[PDB]
Structures are given as C-alpha cells and as structure tokens.
C-alpha cells in the first residue's frame, strides 16, 4: 500500500532474458506455424474467429520497441499464440501438435529462467 513495499525484485535483466527465450522459440523446428502472422486474406475463418492474432515476429517487434511494460505482458502474448492455435487447429494435426510442443517448451524455459 502507500509507503509499504515488498522488497525490490531485480527486473533489469528481464528484457534480455525474454529476448533469449524468444530466440530459442524462433529457432525450434516446430516454430514454422508461428513465425509470421496468419494470412487473413488467404485463410478462411481466421479473421472472424481469432479475435487477437499473435505470432513470434509480432512479439519480436513489440519487444524491440518497448511495447511490453513487464515480463508478464510478454508471457501473455506468447501464450496467446498457442491458445489461438488450439482454437483453430485439431489436436491431431501437424500444426495442432506443433502448438502443444511449443507451449511445453516455452513454459519450461519460463519457469527455469524466472521461478
């Protein structure tokens, strides 16, 4: 509350550490469905159904231009990529399986880097 703060967690390395995580997501072999925005002219249904499209390249631009106020807003966008994927893709598809794999990979890196 006012003049009453928990001890200051060091957040000065977060920007760099989120960048490294993102690099590792970008270079994973199952990243291909997620590297670029879904083409809304060429994929019927996507525009109407997925209210908030997100992809790695868009997260990378937001990161690089100070549009994440803190590390939680960064994790929310990464998770949004996989939640979108689950909304549009059958579990038993290459893309559906890619999303489950990438989400797992991300969540471990997140816990190991920050928890």
Resolution reading in Å? 1.9
* CB crowding 40-65: b at 16 or more within 10 Å, else e: eeeeeebeeebeeebbbeebbeebee
Among residues 40, 32, 38, the alpha carbon closest in space to that of 58 is found at 38
Residues in the chain: 115
Q: How many CA atoms lie within 13 A of 94 on its CB side?
A: 6
Please state, in angstroms and rounded to a whole number, the distance separating the CA atoms of residues 89 and 3: 49
**Domain span at residue 86?**
1-115
Contact between 58 and 40 under an 8 Å Cβ cutoff? The reply is no
Domains contained in the chain, number: 1
Residue 34: give its domain's CATH number: 1.20.920.10
| Distance of alpha carbon 109 from the chain centroid | 12
Give the residue carrying structure tokens 């390395």: 13
Please state, in angstroms and rounded to a whole number, the distance separating the CA atoms of residues 47 and 39: 9
CB neighbours of residue 37 within 10 Å: 13
Among residues 102, 105, 112, 108, the alpha carbon closest in space to that of 55 is found at 102
Which experimental method was this entry solved with? X-ray
Contact between 49 and 88 under an 8 Å Cβ cutoff? The reply is yes
């Amino acid at each position: 509350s006012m003049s009453v703060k928990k001890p200051k967690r060091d957040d000065s390395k977060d920007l760099a550490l989120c960048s490294m995580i993102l690099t590792e997501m970008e270079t994973h072999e199952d990243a291909w469905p997620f590297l670029l925005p879904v083409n809304l002219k060429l994929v019927p249904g996507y525009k109407k159904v997925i209210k908030k499209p997100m992809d790695f390249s868009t997260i990378r631009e937001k990161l690089s231009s100070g549009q994440y106020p803190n590390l939680e807003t960064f994790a929310l966008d990464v998770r949004l990529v996989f939640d979108n994927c689950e909304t549009f893709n059958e579990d038993d598809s290459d893309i559906g399986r890619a999303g489950h794999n990438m989400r797992k990979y991300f969540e471990k890196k997140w816990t190991d880097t920050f928890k």
